[PDB]
Design a protein around this ligand. Structure first.
Ligand SMILES: [Zn+2]
Length: 140
């Protein structure tokens, strides 16, 4: 589990969104596994605005943060997981690393802020849903 809290936005994996998230929806995209809901309280996370390909992610199933290199956001074929069939997922970045379903929502961060959240795992790879292109998170 996990979210990003920026301004009056909460960013979560679409497959983990709550009723309250859907009841306060701003934007969602199944192909990216993202959903954004509105918040009453201001959040303090900063979204990275950059093309970094190195950073650190949180892996809850190891209670550890791992430094990783990660690929550019792309349309990637993902094998079946416990929460999606095998399919193409968009805006996804891969690294070599551990990721199980409970790790979804863990933050990937670079020097500029939050890059994205864990979304995929298996075959020794971890996939992150990028948020750096969602420039509207920075305003309004
Ligand atoms: Zn960066």
């Amino acid at each position: 589990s996990g979210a990003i809290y920026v301004g009056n936005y909460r960013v979560v994996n679409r497959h983990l969104a709550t009723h309250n998230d859907w009841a306060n929806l701003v934007w969602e995209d199944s192909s990216r596994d993202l959903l954004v809901s509105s918040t009453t309280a201001q959040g303090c996370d900063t979204i990275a605005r950059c093309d970094c390909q190195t950073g650190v992610y949180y892996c809850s199933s190891r209670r550890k943060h791992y430094p990783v290199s990660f690929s550019k956001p792309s349309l990637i074929f993902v094998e079946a997981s416990e929460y999606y069939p095998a399919r193409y997922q968009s805006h996804l970045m891969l690294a070599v690393g551990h990721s199980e379903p409970g790790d979804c929502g863990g933050i990937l961060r670079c020097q500029h802020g939050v890059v994205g959240i864990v979304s995929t795992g298996g075959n020794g790879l971890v996939g992150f849903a990028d948020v750096r292109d969602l420039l509207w998170l920075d305003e309004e």
